[PDB]
Amino acid sequence: MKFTVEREHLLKPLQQVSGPLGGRPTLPILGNLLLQVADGTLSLTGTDLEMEMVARVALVQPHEPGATTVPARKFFDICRGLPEGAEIAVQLEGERMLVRSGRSRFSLSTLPAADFPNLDDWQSEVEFTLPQATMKRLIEATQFSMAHQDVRYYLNGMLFETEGEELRTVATDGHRLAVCSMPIGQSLPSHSVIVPRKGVIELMRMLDGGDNPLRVQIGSNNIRAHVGDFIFTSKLVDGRFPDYRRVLPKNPDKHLEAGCDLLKQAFARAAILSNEKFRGVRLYVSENQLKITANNPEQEEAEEILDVTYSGAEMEIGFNVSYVLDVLNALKCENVRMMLTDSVSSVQIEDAASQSAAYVVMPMRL
Amino acid sequence: MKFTVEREHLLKPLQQVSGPLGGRPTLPILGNLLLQVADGTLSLTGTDLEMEMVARVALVQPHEPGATTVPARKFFDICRGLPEGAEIAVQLEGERMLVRSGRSRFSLSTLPAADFPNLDDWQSEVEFTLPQATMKRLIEATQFSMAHQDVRYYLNGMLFETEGEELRTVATDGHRLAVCSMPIGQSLPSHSVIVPRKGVIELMRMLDGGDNPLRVQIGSNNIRAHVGDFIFTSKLVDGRFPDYRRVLPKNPDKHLEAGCDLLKQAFARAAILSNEKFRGVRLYVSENQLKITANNPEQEEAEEILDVTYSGAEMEIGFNVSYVLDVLNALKCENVRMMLTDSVSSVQIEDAASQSAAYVVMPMRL
């Protein structure tokens, strides 16, 4: 296996396939990349057994076919360290891979390609394409609400649902929920899968802004996402997600609208003097006014009063200010709508200007 | 106690005094600031019993005398959270401090001023002033070479030494050393003191980088620095600090000149394949040439060759590559000079264009 490639043509591909990886996987080879020259193409693959990322680079310089497995972080670090515009020449030599550029030379340890974990083939059942920025919006709107290492293992990832011509994400912790829905211009079967949170993370990071469409293929136990020269595959979480329809408030009749930043800043100051563990804050709503109060066990007390747009019945509600601040921080918009019912019902929060994303936070008795 | 002060006049002083205090020390009053209104000045003090920072802010608005202590981090976070141009009105109300600004109101717990640790008075035995820039240069040249937590406690700080008309710092961990001297235009007494690491950090932090001069007072067991409205006091460390004159190589006649950035990037690449614990590389010096090699327990190897200016005898010498990098990262210059003796002696490294700072690194047997 020989190839000579310009540094910059390797950097983005290396960075993408090092995503699954780690620097003691225990299983050593998981800390290696797989390099394959076949045809006029270098392919690079990294995996953690659950998911796999593969990148392809066109070889316009002379090459020879073959395959090996090298330490991913060492190889990336060498390529990154070499100067802007460097030509990088790579050669298999015995049990070692040689890397030369200018006056610099490296020989890395290898592990047999034949030994590199392969994900089983599987058949695609549902497919669609959509713009990258659309998938990226969908994930970023909701990712912060996934659980991390909950016993309820199906919460530790993100639901991707297709319905009508819409693709929707849903993430919940069991405490707060996020849902985002975008039209993507293709009639879709009605279908749900759960992508593991590590996979959501890798998917999110393969999306580079650009003009390359994302093609998605879903099978019974896998998902694959292909954009330009990058192909991501993951196992799905074999589990039953909650239904977000059962979580949204029922026709809330009390709408408050405020400046997102003014609201965020008020909650952020009040939060200083909230209970460190439970983070309860109280809202008092009244005609075009919101009062926020926080206390803590030391009986310190904050209070914020700000002008808002509200014409509903006066009411109080409590909730967790960290959850509310996470939503406000996700939204990044001019104005926010809080859809309220009473002191004993969840709140739904949205960009005043778009119903695409919606967030549900549960009431606290304070 | 009452005062009203514009956010932007309170923020910097608060950040300075509150910085190094925790959110929740065992001994709670050390987590508080002492606030004192007296004679048309607000004084803010923080301490950890070794060192103390005091800021003074002239009160140009109506105020009333008195003193209390409040949680440092919380008071800062409330003031920082308030909008630009906020006027902050504070008043002691029983045993709570009320902070009010716009329609935001906070009530903080207090501890009695009379319980706030008072550092003993002491006498100044040496005094000088210098430009803030000069102290910045002195500390930044050397701080990286201080030990972090050596059982030789005096190595964990920084020697400040007056000789003639110069101020000098020196830092060392017994393996590598930094020393930097600058002229300060006063005839000084020959004196040395050691400042603990935490004190060096604060000294650096207090340097806003305007041209308020710094005024330093040194006593038998303390140091004080005074810039603008800030006053920083620390205890000094006991023990016999090494004498850099003895660490500097006696006569490092072999002189090498190289581009600083080239040389850095070559060591940084080589280091990837050096032993993760011991970090050894080997330099081969020859006529106008430097070759750097590395290898690790995996038998992986790097080699860099670069052009340099050298006319001495050929020599081979091993180093801990992290030590060399640290020095090249600290030299923010075009060309570096290295000054060698032999394979078992230390190397001296300096800016080819300035002799103000010198760095000495002890060799490895590899």
Swiss-Prot record, chains A, B:
Stretches for region 2: 129-243
CDD domains: beta_clamp (cd00140)
Entry-linked InterPro entries: DNA_clamp_sf (IPR046938), DNA_polIII_beta (IPR001001), DNA_polIII_beta_C (IPR022635), DNA_polIII_beta_cen (IPR022637), DNA_polIII_beta_N (IPR022634)
BP terms from Gene Ontology: bacterial-type DNA replication; DNA damage response; DNA strand elongation involved in DNA replication; DNA-templated DNA replication; error-prone translesion synthesis; negative regulation of DNA-templated DNA replication initiation; regulation of DNA-templated DNA replication initiation
Pfam family, one: DNA_pol3_beta_2
Region listing for 1, in residue ranges: 1-120
Induction statement: Part of the dnaA-dnaN-recF-gyrB operon, but also transcribed from at least 3 promoters within the upstream dnaA gene, induced at 42 degrees Celsius. Induced 1.5-fold by hydroxyurea. A shorter isoform, beta* is induced by UV treatment and also at low levels in late logarithmic/early stationary phase growth (at protein level). Beta* transcription induced by naldixic acid.
Applied value in biotechnology: Small molecules can bind to the hydrophobic cleft and inhibit binding of various protein factors, suggesting this may make and attractive antibiotic target.
Residues that bind DNA: 24, 73, 149, 153-154
Function statement: Confers DNA tethering and processivity to DNA polymerases and other proteins. Acts as a clamp, forming a ring around DNA (a reaction catalyzed by the clamp-loading complex) which diffuses in an ATP-independent manner freely and bidirectionally along dsDNA. DNA bound in the ring is bent 22 degrees, in solution primed DNA is bound more tightly than dsDNA, suggesting the clamp binds both ss- and dsDNA. In a complex of DNA with this protein, alpha, epsilon and tau subunits however the DNA is only slightly bent.
Stated name of the protein: Beta sliding clamp
The species this protein was found in: Escherichia coli (strain K12)
Source species taxonomy: Bacteria, Pseudomonadati, Pseudomonadota, Gammaproteobacteria, Enterobacterales
Name of the gene: dnaN
